[PDB]
Amino acid sequence: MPILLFLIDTSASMNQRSHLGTTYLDTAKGAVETFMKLRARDPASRGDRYMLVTFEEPPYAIKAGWKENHATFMNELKNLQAEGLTTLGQSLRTAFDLLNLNRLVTGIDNYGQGRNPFFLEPAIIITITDGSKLTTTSGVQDELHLPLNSPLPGSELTKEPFRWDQRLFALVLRLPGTMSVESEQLTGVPLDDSAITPMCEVTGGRSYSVCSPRMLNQCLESLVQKVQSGVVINFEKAGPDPSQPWHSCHKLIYVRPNVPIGHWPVPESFWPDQNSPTLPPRTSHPVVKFSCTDCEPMVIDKLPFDKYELEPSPLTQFILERKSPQTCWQVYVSNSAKYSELGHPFGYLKASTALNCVNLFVMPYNYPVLLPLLDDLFKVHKPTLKWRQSFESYLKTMPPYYLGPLKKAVRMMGAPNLIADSMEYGLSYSVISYLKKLSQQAKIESDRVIGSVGKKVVQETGIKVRSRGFQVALLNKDLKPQTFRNAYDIPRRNLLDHLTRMRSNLLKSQVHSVPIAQMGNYQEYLKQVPSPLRELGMMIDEAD
Amino acid sequence: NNHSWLIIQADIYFATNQYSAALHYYLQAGAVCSDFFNKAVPPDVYTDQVIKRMIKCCSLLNCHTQVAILCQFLREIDYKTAFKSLQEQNSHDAMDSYYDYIWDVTILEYLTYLHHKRGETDKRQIAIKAIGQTELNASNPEEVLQLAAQRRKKKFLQAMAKLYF
Ligand SMILES: [Mn+2]
């Protein structure tokens, strides 16, 4: 269930002509057309909803939100006008607000109950802009800043507008006015050096310094290849390997469905307690610290193991360089233990024996002290009281949010009456009431935003004449002139002939200005026509 | 024809708030250095202090688009005063006739936003047509951009010389 939000720059700097003779906005719309042409090639991409956001003011910024059909998205894209400032930060904030609007009401973001890779709403934001400096009414901002004046309810719990399953990509159109190609374009796509690049990088995406139409096609093709479902992980390196690029990496870990399934959440970066009125703000990308140490990938039976294939990354390049398919590297998260800060290993990165991919294997919170114990229980068959006190000892080194899924898993193995069946949730009632309040407010503001996306409000047509109040009207097309009903609409030069026409028309004895889209519709025209008696290079040229 | 003394006379008038006369003598000094603005004016004459004084002289005479043109003479283009001046509506200069002397795309982006917000669509079309110019593309090769800036600089300073001499 992907989402494709397009953050089309509509600043007036997008009116710069390229050597093609078309403005940057024209190539931006064309790049969107090319993107959906390429995306529609994949037959698993059929189910996909596009959104549209521009750089306009907040009531007019969004032009295709939720529950807007693809035809409206197309019509809104075609009719965009580059007439604003480069309010890129405000547009990014409203783009992320659009995506994270429904997260609280449906509770995909489980706050304090662990981070679930299997509970996600995948989406990517593609912002097609130019390299021109940011602009506001005050001046040039010269650095991408995201406004925080009117936070969405629940925005304090993530600390960053961009979410786990959201990535930002940029198409910074650098097409020059004069034809200046060379063999430099034959190389790979470069990165940009503008203000959108760092925010693109921290979201797990990247920018695309496009300077030619052929490299525009390359950038769009790579972008189609990067529309994938999954979550991003801020991988961090812990300990020495046997500057390096694996020390800090935001990489995607794909999620495969068959409604994706999964059982073990990623641990939170706090120890839950029942006496905290407010929940800590978890980071958007959960830092995981992998120990650069050889370790064994031991596996037991009848228990949920979740495989998450990584994106090809310098982490995978490191794994293939040190090809050790039959061992594993432990991964843990800080601030996930009451009695420790280093945490405990909850997962491991094991390279596939064929060395085709590196897959994350998320396990319970401290798996080397559960898997032998549970495997001993399942191979020793009653339980022993020594096993019972060992199980309780595990629960002392175990955060509460794993208890529910662990009990669910243990029920699945065929022993519901095990020790973990007591059940709880281990979080403050104040937190739960705050969560219900957040759900209610998220639902209400969701309704408000979805209503506002249709843009039932309109702009005025005044000038506000000064006294160097009263205003002179502006011209308004498609205002439905009432020439046959109003004599004031008649031009003086066209008065006598119009008079004759409407004189005849009043007696017993404008039209043909249909929009071009519904002009060659022969299916529609024949549908509204009676049936006759039944019988006894390029792309299209109409009527097939 | 001593540009140092001409700058001194311009500053003498500038301190006494004779802004038209101050502009007169600043342009006279510039026309001494560059041969009636046929060459680039040396940076040691039209320093950023001198250009900022010229900016103040133009602003105090309500020639606000002329302030917008002079704002891109500076080594670091001063968008704050340029945008502040273009918000003004009591202009005593040709306004839309000066949009051919703006080579900065950011200034024209702001002009298009202003004329769209304020409802003057025809001036907005003039600004959009100015942005939609091949030589104005900010992604052009560098030598093209200095050439566009230099020719617009020469034409603008010659127009100011005609107006102020
Ligand atoms: Mn035809």
XYZ file of C-alpha atoms and ligand atoms in Angstrom:
710
model
C 0.000 0.000 0.000
C 2.487 2.673 -1.120
C 2.063 6.431 -1.065
C 3.795 8.756 -3.535
C 3.729 12.361 -2.361
C 5.061 14.900 -4.847
C 6.347 18.146 -3.354
C 6.449 20.162 -6.562
C 8.341 23.423 -6.142
C 6.075 26.229 -7.321
C 8.351 29.134 -6.494
C 8.641 31.622 -9.334
C 12.269 30.549 -9.834
C 10.761 27.433 -11.415
C 9.903 29.643 -14.401
C 13.526 29.506 -15.563
C 13.733 28.130 -19.067
C 15.992 25.235 -19.863
C 17.528 24.742 -23.302
C 14.410 22.718 -24.160
C 12.434 25.971 -24.145
C 10.248 24.768 -21.285
C 10.360 26.156 -17.772
C 11.638 24.082 -14.862
C 8.032 23.651 -13.759
C 7.181 22.188 -17.165
C 9.980 19.637 -16.880
C 8.917 19.027 -13.271
C 5.396 18.116 -14.346
C 6.856 16.067 -17.192
C 9.126 14.280 -14.721
C 6.059 13.390 -12.673
C 4.450 12.052 -15.878
C 7.557 10.032 -16.659
C 7.656 8.741 -13.091
C 4.119 7.386 -13.186
C 4.742 5.990 -16.680
C 7.732 4.062 -15.311
C 6.047 3.171 -12.013
C 2.946 1.766 -13.749
C 5.203 -0.704 -15.589
C 5.555 -2.763 -12.390
C 2.345 -4.849 -12.108
C 2.645 -4.948 -8.312
C 2.520 -1.124 -8.323
C -1.123 -1.113 -9.521
C -2.319 -0.495 -5.974
C -0.757 2.909 -5.284
C -2.036 6.336 -4.225
C -0.366 9.562 -5.315
C -0.494 12.816 -3.388
C 0.431 16.330 -4.425
C 1.760 19.239 -2.379
C 3.112 22.550 -3.627
C 4.862 25.572 -2.126
C 1.701 27.638 -1.757
C 0.029 28.849 1.421
C -1.289 26.144 3.839
C -4.950 26.154 2.651
C -3.734 25.917 -0.958
C -0.538 23.899 -0.411
C -2.135 20.460 -0.618
C -3.786 19.662 -3.937
C -4.308 15.900 -3.649
C -4.580 14.461 -0.156
C -6.321 11.317 0.976
C -9.522 10.095 -0.711
C -8.796 12.071 -3.880
C -9.005 10.123 -7.119
C -6.108 9.925 -9.565
C -7.992 12.074 -12.099
C -8.041 14.990 -9.642
C -4.316 14.495 -8.995
C -3.652 14.645 -12.744
C -5.831 17.725 -13.231
C -4.197 19.502 -10.293
C -0.693 18.648 -11.508
C -1.383 19.941 -15.018
C -2.683 23.301 -13.815
C 0.073 24.250 -11.347
C 1.500 27.751 -11.581
C 4.909 28.935 -10.373
C 4.017 32.145 -8.555
C 5.190 31.814 -4.938
C 8.357 32.024 -2.898
C 10.730 29.175 -2.093
C 9.118 28.347 1.238
C 10.692 24.908 1.162
C 10.779 24.392 4.931
C 7.104 25.220 5.404
C 6.166 22.991 2.469
C 8.221 20.113 3.905
C 6.483 20.570 7.261
C 3.051 20.459 5.635
C 4.117 17.459 3.519
C 5.131 15.485 6.608
C 1.994 16.703 8.394
C -0.080 15.275 5.545
C 1.600 11.874 5.811
C 1.672 11.652 9.628
C -1.881 12.865 9.962
C -3.527 9.445 10.218
C -0.776 7.736 12.206
C -2.275 8.337 15.644
C -5.915 7.448 14.982
C -5.017 4.055 13.520
C -2.056 3.695 15.891
C 0.577 2.491 13.440
C 3.100 4.364 15.608
C 3.095 2.271 18.793
C 4.383 4.662 21.446
C 5.958 2.835 24.373
C 4.901 -0.586 23.050
C 7.961 -1.014 20.848
C 8.648 -0.125 17.234
C 7.020 -2.588 14.852
C 8.576 -2.871 11.373
C 5.499 -4.901 10.428
C 3.220 -1.941 11.305
C 4.071 0.694 8.722
C 2.499 3.066 6.202
C 5.110 3.279 3.428
C 5.521 6.543 1.547
C 8.205 8.583 -0.157
C 8.232 12.333 -0.713
C 9.747 13.422 -4.011
C 10.474 17.147 -3.982
C 11.278 18.423 -7.468
C 12.914 21.813 -7.023
C 15.772 23.877 -8.362
C 18.971 24.877 -6.687
C 17.774 28.429 -6.062
C 18.139 29.773 -2.546
C 15.257 29.675 -0.112
C 13.096 32.763 0.075
C 10.536 34.183 2.477
C 8.882 37.563 2.832
C 11.682 38.619 5.195
C 14.585 37.569 2.976
C 16.786 34.595 2.058
C 16.896 31.881 4.727
C 20.098 30.263 3.296
C 19.521 27.055 5.325
C 16.680 24.562 5.518
C 14.745 25.141 8.746
C 11.484 23.375 9.522
C 8.894 25.531 11.324
C 7.502 24.321 14.652
C 4.960 27.063 15.373
C 1.770 24.941 15.288
C 2.729 21.363 16.186
C 0.401 18.547 15.303
C -0.859 16.733 18.426
C 1.590 13.986 19.305
C 4.522 15.572 17.440
C 6.420 15.823 20.733
C 6.773 12.023 20.886
C 8.837 11.640 17.686
C 11.093 14.767 17.955
C 11.427 14.852 14.147
C 8.704 15.465 11.538
C 9.839 12.626 9.277
C 8.798 9.168 10.354
C 10.204 5.655 10.260
C 8.753 4.604 6.896
C 9.006 7.983 5.152
C 11.913 8.990 2.940
C 12.631 12.242 1.146
C 14.084 12.474 -2.353
C 14.929 15.617 -4.277
C 15.066 16.347 -7.999
C 17.084 19.556 -8.078
C 16.720 20.551 -11.724
C 19.989 22.136 -12.859
C 19.198 22.223 -16.570
C 21.110 25.187 -18.032
C 19.643 27.697 -20.425
C 22.225 26.987 -23.105
C 23.057 23.543 -24.484
C 26.224 22.612 -22.574
C 26.426 18.801 -22.495
C 29.621 16.715 -22.517
C 30.896 13.280 -21.485
C 30.564 14.393 -17.839
C 26.888 13.384 -17.985
C 27.923 9.872 -19.101
C 29.059 9.155 -15.533
C 26.700 8.368 -12.676
C 24.178 10.720 -11.110
C 25.775 13.252 -8.726
C 24.579 14.521 -5.388
C 23.512 18.100 -4.835
C 25.072 20.717 -2.572
C 21.935 22.688 -1.739
C 19.900 22.976 1.444
C 17.620 20.058 0.558
C 20.528 17.574 0.519
C 21.175 17.195 4.305
C 17.491 16.801 5.138
C 17.264 14.326 2.247
C 20.174 12.381 3.730
C 18.855 12.239 7.307
C 15.526 10.842 6.074
C 17.220 7.854 4.460
C 16.744 9.226 0.949
C 19.014 11.314 -1.241
C 19.048 14.196 -3.687
C 19.666 14.066 -7.434
C 21.660 16.858 -9.057
C 20.097 16.516 -12.506
C 21.635 18.671 -15.244
C 20.422 17.058 -18.483
C 17.266 15.400 -19.851
C 18.945 12.002 -20.263
C 20.234 12.118 -16.700
C 16.719 13.218 -15.747
C 15.466 9.932 -17.197
C 18.213 8.094 -15.297
C 17.275 9.848 -12.042
C 13.605 9.012 -12.531
C 14.384 5.349 -13.284
C 16.530 5.066 -10.149
C 13.708 6.729 -8.204
C 11.244 4.084 -9.397
C 13.739 1.442 -8.275
C 13.849 3.087 -4.823
C 10.073 3.045 -4.190
C 10.081 0.123 -1.760
C 8.186 -0.889 1.351
C 10.148 -1.078 4.569
C 11.574 0.942 7.418
C 14.846 2.828 7.753
C 17.333 2.085 10.537
C 20.092 4.397 11.786
C 22.827 1.773 11.981
C 25.679 2.670 14.346
C 29.000 0.880 14.808
C 30.095 -0.312 18.256
C 33.625 -1.550 18.882
C 36.527 -2.210 16.506
C 36.273 -4.295 13.354
C 38.771 -7.140 12.748
C 36.957 6.877 9.345
C 34.834 4.145 7.755
C 31.454 4.377 5.981
C 29.782 1.682 8.115
C 30.084 3.777 11.292
C 26.819 5.630 10.596
C 24.333 4.435 7.988
C 20.608 4.964 7.430
C 19.546 1.974 5.355
C 16.216 0.436 4.452
C 15.200 -3.011 5.726
C 12.500 -4.400 3.460
C 9.199 -5.764 4.736
C 7.499 -8.618 2.890
C 3.784 -9.365 3.300
C 2.295 -12.871 3.114
C -0.977 -7.032 5.741
C 2.667 -7.727 6.643
C 3.306 -10.122 9.512
C 5.773 -9.995 12.367
C 6.008 -10.444 16.099
C 9.069 -8.876 17.722
C 9.214 -5.079 18.076
C 12.468 -3.149 18.132
C 13.253 -2.041 21.717
C 12.469 1.488 22.790
C 15.157 3.896 23.968
C 13.822 4.128 27.547
C 12.860 1.798 30.375
C 9.059 1.967 30.796
C 7.637 2.903 34.187
C 4.165 3.410 35.617
C 4.980 6.750 37.306
C 5.897 8.880 34.273
C 3.182 11.425 33.353
C 4.803 12.042 29.942
C 6.457 9.574 27.569
C 10.007 10.261 26.354
C 10.426 11.436 22.744
C 11.762 8.529 20.719
C 14.008 9.332 17.773
C 12.621 8.974 14.254
C 15.304 6.462 13.260
C 15.991 3.966 16.072
C 19.732 3.784 16.573
C 21.022 0.212 16.694
C 24.617 -0.394 17.749
C 26.176 -3.470 16.170
C 29.208 -4.975 17.877
C 32.064 -5.623 15.439
C 32.608 -9.100 16.880
C 32.148 -12.624 15.543
C 29.180 -14.467 17.020
C 27.125 -17.566 16.307
C 23.623 -17.342 14.720
C 21.930 -20.075 16.752
C 18.289 -20.827 15.920
C 15.597 -22.886 17.673
C 12.280 -24.385 16.541
C 8.568 -23.429 16.596
C 9.396 -19.843 17.576
C 8.873 -16.615 15.569
C 11.999 -15.442 13.792
C 11.582 -12.388 11.565
C 13.850 -11.955 8.541
C 14.356 -8.423 7.195
C 16.493 -8.137 4.069
C 18.655 -5.031 4.074
C 18.999 -2.511 1.311
C 22.302 -2.771 -0.589
C 24.445 -0.449 1.507
C 28.101 0.025 2.477
C 27.132 -2.208 5.414
C 26.413 -4.953 2.870
C 29.615 -4.009 1.030
C 31.505 -4.491 4.313
C 29.746 -7.824 4.898
C 30.696 -9.096 1.448
C 34.277 -7.814 1.808
C 34.612 -9.765 5.067
C 32.738 -12.783 3.720
C 31.855 -14.801 6.838
C 28.475 -16.342 5.919
C 28.216 -18.804 8.821
C 28.735 -16.307 11.667
C 26.786 -13.266 12.840
C 27.225 -9.807 14.337
C 25.207 -8.867 17.418
C 23.055 -5.718 17.484
C 21.649 -3.879 20.500
C 20.169 -0.507 21.429
C 21.189 1.899 24.176
C 18.848 3.084 26.944
C 16.874 -0.170 26.819
C 17.745 -1.644 30.228
C 16.939 -0.630 33.788
C 20.172 -2.012 35.254
C 22.373 -1.125 32.263
C 22.838 1.445 29.511
C 24.595 -0.748 26.926
C 21.423 -2.839 26.660
C 21.219 -6.449 25.576
C 21.481 -8.108 22.145
C 17.998 -8.445 20.667
C 19.018 -9.324 17.117
C 21.834 -10.252 14.797
C 22.943 -9.625 11.222
C 23.645 -12.942 9.500
C 24.914 -12.996 5.936
C 23.164 -15.437 3.632
C 25.296 -18.457 2.733
C 24.914 -17.619 -0.969
C 26.148 -14.073 -0.120
C 23.185 -12.649 -2.039
C 21.858 -10.502 0.815
C 22.351 -9.531 4.448
C 19.258 -10.010 6.590
C 18.406 -8.637 10.011
C 17.050 -11.258 12.411
C 15.085 -9.550 15.174
C 14.584 -11.763 18.236
C 13.246 -11.133 21.784
C 15.023 -8.572 23.940
C 17.734 -10.878 25.297
C 17.648 -13.901 23.016
C 20.833 -15.805 24.134
C 19.209 -16.124 27.592
C 15.767 -17.173 26.298
C 16.431 -19.407 23.285
C 18.583 -22.003 25.159
C 16.130 -21.866 28.079
C 12.985 -22.270 25.961
C 14.685 -24.892 23.792
C 15.610 -26.758 26.991
C 11.959 -26.643 28.071
C 10.750 -27.948 24.715
C 13.351 -30.726 24.514
C 13.205 -31.812 28.180
C 9.602 -33.056 27.950
C 6.789 -30.743 32.785
C 8.443 -27.446 33.749
C 10.834 -27.283 36.693
C 10.754 -24.752 39.530
C 14.391 -23.933 38.721
C 13.163 -23.123 35.213
C 10.409 -21.006 36.810
C 12.812 -18.871 38.844
C 15.065 -18.595 35.774
C 12.040 -17.386 33.783
C 11.299 -14.812 36.479
C 14.968 -13.748 36.393
C 14.580 -13.206 32.652
C 11.543 -11.006 33.339
C 13.726 -8.816 35.546
C 15.972 -8.193 32.507
C 13.033 -7.696 30.142
C 11.097 -4.563 29.157
C 7.291 -4.880 29.423
C 6.349 -4.387 25.753
C 7.917 -7.708 24.720
C 5.727 -9.626 27.202
C 2.570 -9.459 25.090
C 4.138 -10.772 21.872
C 6.120 -13.361 23.856
C 2.905 -14.650 25.435
C 1.297 -14.600 21.969
C 4.175 -16.652 20.548
C 4.157 -19.110 23.481
C 0.420 -19.551 22.943
C 1.144 -20.263 19.272
C 3.693 -23.010 20.094
C 0.969 -24.957 21.914
C 1.432 -24.128 25.606
C -0.834 -21.196 26.569
C -0.695 -22.099 30.278
C 2.988 -21.160 30.546
C 4.296 -18.613 33.038
C 3.954 -15.575 30.736
C 0.130 -15.923 30.590
C -0.495 -13.432 33.441
C -0.438 -10.522 30.905
C -0.148 -6.738 31.394
C 1.021 -3.683 29.459
C 3.378 -1.950 31.923
C 2.684 1.691 31.129
C 1.173 4.650 32.938
C -2.567 5.276 32.933
C -1.711 8.936 32.311
C 0.102 7.827 29.146
C -2.878 5.731 28.015
C -5.358 8.555 28.640
C -3.016 10.916 26.787
C -2.950 8.387 23.939
C -6.758 8.275 23.748
C -6.782 12.093 23.791
C -4.222 12.108 20.971
C -6.355 9.646 19.002
C -9.450 11.840 19.414
C -7.615 15.043 18.456
C -5.911 13.300 15.530
C -9.291 12.099 14.255
C -10.819 15.587 14.544
C -7.912 17.378 12.858
C -7.793 14.614 10.236
C -11.404 15.393 9.349
C -10.594 19.116 9.304
C -7.590 18.693 6.991
C -9.372 16.275 4.621
C -12.184 18.811 4.337
C -9.734 21.661 3.674
C -7.893 19.729 0.915
C -10.855 20.262 -1.435
C -10.221 24.043 -1.136
C -13.787 25.264 -0.697
C -12.348 28.695 0.156
C -11.425 31.106 -2.642
C -9.209 34.138 -3.214
C -10.476 37.701 -3.670
C -10.178 39.948 -6.741
C -9.441 43.388 -5.273
C -6.712 46.014 -5.323
C -7.520 48.082 -2.150
C -7.117 51.582 -3.614
C -5.028 53.785 -1.316
C -5.318 57.443 -0.301
C -1.970 58.788 -1.502
C -11.428 50.380 1.480
C -12.478 50.970 -2.108
C -10.991 48.596 -4.675
C -11.097 48.007 -8.412
C -12.091 44.513 -9.451
C -9.829 42.141 -11.334
C -10.736 40.152 -14.418
C -12.156 36.706 -13.628
C -12.443 34.053 -16.326
C -15.245 31.455 -16.218
C -17.388 33.823 -14.144
C -20.383 32.684 -16.292
C -21.321 35.867 -18.217
C -25.066 36.409 -18.308
C -25.135 38.347 -21.587
C -28.587 37.102 -22.530
C -29.775 37.812 -18.972
C -27.751 40.972 -18.262
C -27.366 43.875 -20.652
C -24.401 45.239 -18.701
C -22.217 42.405 -19.976
C -22.656 43.505 -23.574
C -19.635 45.244 -25.102
C -20.455 48.431 -26.943
C -18.811 47.261 -30.171
C -20.777 44.008 -30.031
C -24.067 45.642 -29.086
C -26.268 45.734 -32.195
C -25.486 42.212 -33.364
C -25.944 40.784 -29.879
C -29.179 42.746 -29.654
C -30.428 41.159 -32.873
C -29.383 37.715 -31.669
C -31.100 37.889 -28.312
C -34.133 39.553 -29.881
C -34.483 36.550 -32.189
C -33.727 34.191 -29.314
C -36.511 35.650 -27.172
C -38.937 35.073 -30.049
C -40.141 31.621 -31.140
C -36.800 30.999 -32.864
C -20.711 30.644 -24.821
C -22.086 27.416 -26.348
C -19.379 25.166 -27.897
C -16.713 26.038 -25.324
C -16.383 22.627 -23.652
C -13.100 21.780 -21.890
C -10.676 19.981 -24.192
C -10.567 16.873 -21.967
C -14.277 16.191 -22.535
C -14.223 17.150 -26.197
C -13.240 13.970 -28.034
C -15.164 11.644 -25.707
C -16.964 9.334 -28.127
C -17.794 6.699 -25.521
C -19.581 9.360 -23.452
C -21.248 10.910 -26.510
C -22.526 7.553 -27.799
C -23.730 6.624 -24.293
C -25.947 9.736 -24.342
C -27.234 8.826 -27.833
C -29.754 6.184 -29.006
C -28.619 2.815 -30.308
C -29.021 1.973 -34.004
C -30.446 -1.213 -35.495
C -28.239 -4.242 -35.007
C -26.516 -5.893 -37.954
C -27.594 -8.929 -39.954
C 6.718 5.676 -34.228
C 3.881 7.438 -32.367
C 1.438 6.211 -29.661
C -2.201 7.240 -30.400
C -4.174 9.118 -33.131
C -7.679 8.994 -31.523
C -10.348 6.319 -32.156
C -7.483 3.798 -31.840
C 37.418 63.981 -13.554
C 38.948 63.042 -10.196
C 36.825 60.156 -8.967
C 38.218 60.343 -5.429
C 37.150 63.976 -5.146
C 33.853 63.150 -6.851
C 33.180 60.505 -4.200
C 34.110 63.091 -1.572
C 31.575 65.540 -3.024
C 28.948 62.780 -3.160
C 29.553 61.914 0.489
C 29.480 65.605 1.451
C 26.054 65.867 -0.163
C 25.027 62.528 1.358
C 25.728 63.674 4.918
C 23.651 66.820 4.322
C 20.771 64.659 2.942
C 20.934 65.924 -0.654
C 20.197 62.472 -2.007
C 19.662 63.474 -5.638
C 22.937 65.404 -5.649
C 24.719 62.570 -3.845
C 23.538 60.120 -6.509
C 24.637 62.591 -9.175
C 28.179 62.645 -7.884
C 28.389 58.884 -7.201
C 27.410 58.196 -10.797
C 29.874 60.860 -11.945
C 32.672 59.086 -10.074
C 31.615 55.775 -11.604
C 31.549 57.319 -15.078
C 35.051 58.663 -14.491
C 36.411 55.250 -13.531
C 34.624 53.136 -16.117
C 34.421 55.121 -19.333
C 30.734 56.038 -18.995
C 30.155 52.543 -17.601
C 31.557 50.880 -20.710
C 33.885 48.859 -18.482
C 33.350 47.360 -15.069
C 33.584 49.963 -12.333
C 36.648 49.171 -10.188
C 35.760 47.647 -6.810
C 38.033 50.104 -5.006
C 35.766 52.970 -6.135
C 32.271 51.468 -6.052
C 33.009 49.764 -2.771
C 30.212 48.129 -0.817
C 30.139 51.244 1.365
C 29.690 53.461 -1.709
C 27.051 51.127 -3.157
C 25.253 51.027 0.195
C 25.238 54.826 0.240
C 23.827 54.763 -3.303
C 21.184 52.296 -2.070
C 20.201 54.697 0.706
C 20.096 57.620 -1.718
C 17.780 55.752 -4.093
C 15.552 54.503 -1.264
C 15.077 57.973 0.215
C 13.917 59.207 -3.212
C 11.239 56.462 -3.467
C 12.908 54.852 -6.489
C 12.479 51.369 -5.108
C 13.145 49.175 -8.114
C 16.355 51.179 -8.541
C 17.183 50.070 -5.000
C 16.474 46.511 -6.125
C 18.877 46.856 -9.077
C 21.646 48.317 -6.945
C 21.238 45.585 -4.319
C 22.954 43.050 -6.600
C 25.995 45.275 -7.119
C 27.177 44.325 -3.641
C 29.663 41.514 -3.070
C 27.046 39.727 -0.963
C 23.635 40.462 -2.466
C 21.483 42.179 0.149
C 18.101 40.536 -0.221
C 16.681 42.056 2.969
C 16.672 45.676 1.809
C 15.864 44.650 -1.766
C 12.758 42.766 -0.636
C 11.843 45.543 1.798
C 12.115 48.176 -0.944
C 10.099 46.171 -3.463
C 7.227 45.870 -0.960
C 6.834 49.649 -1.201
C 4.117 50.915 -3.519
C 4.877 54.657 -3.638
C 7.548 54.262 -6.307
C 8.785 57.261 -8.276
C 10.660 55.201 -10.862
C 9.618 53.320 -13.982
C 9.029 50.121 -11.936
C 8.271 47.438 -14.504
C 10.579 49.033 -17.069
C 13.520 48.298 -14.766
C 12.809 44.541 -14.526
C 15.122 44.094 -17.564
C 18.083 45.198 -15.372
C 17.533 42.488 -12.746
C 19.776 39.501 -13.360
C 19.245 37.836 -9.992
C 16.620 35.108 -10.163
C 15.835 35.494 -6.455
C 14.856 39.157 -6.874
C 12.600 38.247 -9.792
C 11.089 35.352 -7.839
C 10.176 37.804 -5.107
C 8.839 40.271 -7.687
C 6.602 37.619 -9.207
C 5.360 36.626 -5.760
C 4.674 40.267 -4.902
C 2.824 41.036 -8.115
C 0.809 37.853 -7.769
C -0.085 38.550 -4.134
C -1.005 42.148 -4.899
C -3.064 41.170 -7.922
C -1.265 43.007 -10.736
C -1.180 40.131 -13.195
C 0.360 42.004 -16.137
C 3.436 43.071 -14.147
C 3.556 39.505 -12.848
C 3.673 38.325 -16.464
C 6.521 40.756 -17.141
C 8.487 39.353 -14.189
C 7.761 35.758 -15.264
C 8.890 36.544 -18.815
C 12.066 38.009 -17.313
C 12.725 34.833 -15.287
C 11.962 32.706 -18.314
C 15.068 33.848 -20.129
C 17.826 31.602 -21.375
C 20.660 33.919 -20.330
C 19.022 34.344 -16.905
C 19.170 30.660 -15.985
C 21.039 30.359 -12.688
C 22.409 26.988 -13.834
C 24.114 28.560 -16.854
C 27.895 28.312 -17.202
C 29.558 30.941 -15.051
C 31.010 33.120 -17.848
C 27.498 33.452 -19.284
C 26.212 34.674 -15.896
C 28.886 37.354 -15.432
C 28.310 38.465 -19.015
C 24.560 38.859 -18.402
C 25.229 40.689 -15.139
C 27.863 42.930 -16.752
C 25.708 43.962 -19.702
C 22.714 44.637 -17.425
C 25.006 46.551 -15.068
C 26.269 48.709 -17.923
C 22.780 49.422 -19.266
C 21.405 50.217 -15.811
C 24.233 52.569 -14.868
C 24.000 54.329 -18.231
C 20.250 54.758 -17.720
C 20.897 56.194 -14.261
C 23.515 58.518 -15.748
C 20.969 59.745 -18.292
C 18.399 60.243 -15.552
C 20.753 61.855 -13.025
C 23.131 63.980 -15.094
Mn -7.747 12.240 -34.323
